Amino acid sequence: VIRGDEVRQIAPGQTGKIADYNYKLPDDFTGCVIAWNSNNLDSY
Amino acid sequence: QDVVNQNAQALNTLVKQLSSNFGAISSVLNDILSRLDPPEAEVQIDRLIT
């Protein structure tokens, strides 16, 4: 689970703390990324 | 003299070709390879290589 402003950071070659420190996607073909909202899941 | 001079001139222009930026960001490889992210670095390198 990630911040709403980190969707631009999960990609091949994205600069930022979140990707370059926790999960950096290899700069190659990527199957793909799926996500949705969790306002009723956790919202800590 | 024509053979020697013309061969030398062809080699000279071959070496001179490295100065040209070939529409890339810059000519010297290390500068672009340092001051560009690897994504854009691959594109610029591709341009220079072709």
Please check whether residue B34 is in contact with residue B44, taking contact to mean a CB–CB distance below 8 angstroms. Answer: no
Q: How was this structure determined?
A: cryo-EM
Buried b (16+ CB within 10 A) or exposed e, A7-24: eebbeeebeeeebeeeeb
Chain B residues closer than 8 Å to A15 by CB: 37
A-chain residues near B37 (CB < 8 A): 13, 15
**Tokens found for residue B40:** 């854009």
Give the residue from A32, A31, A12, A34 showing the smallest Cα distance to A23. A12
Asked if A13 contacts A27 with a C-beta cutoff of 8 angstroms, the reply is yes
Interface size between A and B, measured as CB pairs under 8 A:
8
Model resolution, angstroms: 3.8
Query: From CA A13, how far away is CA A34, in angstroms rounded?
Result: 18
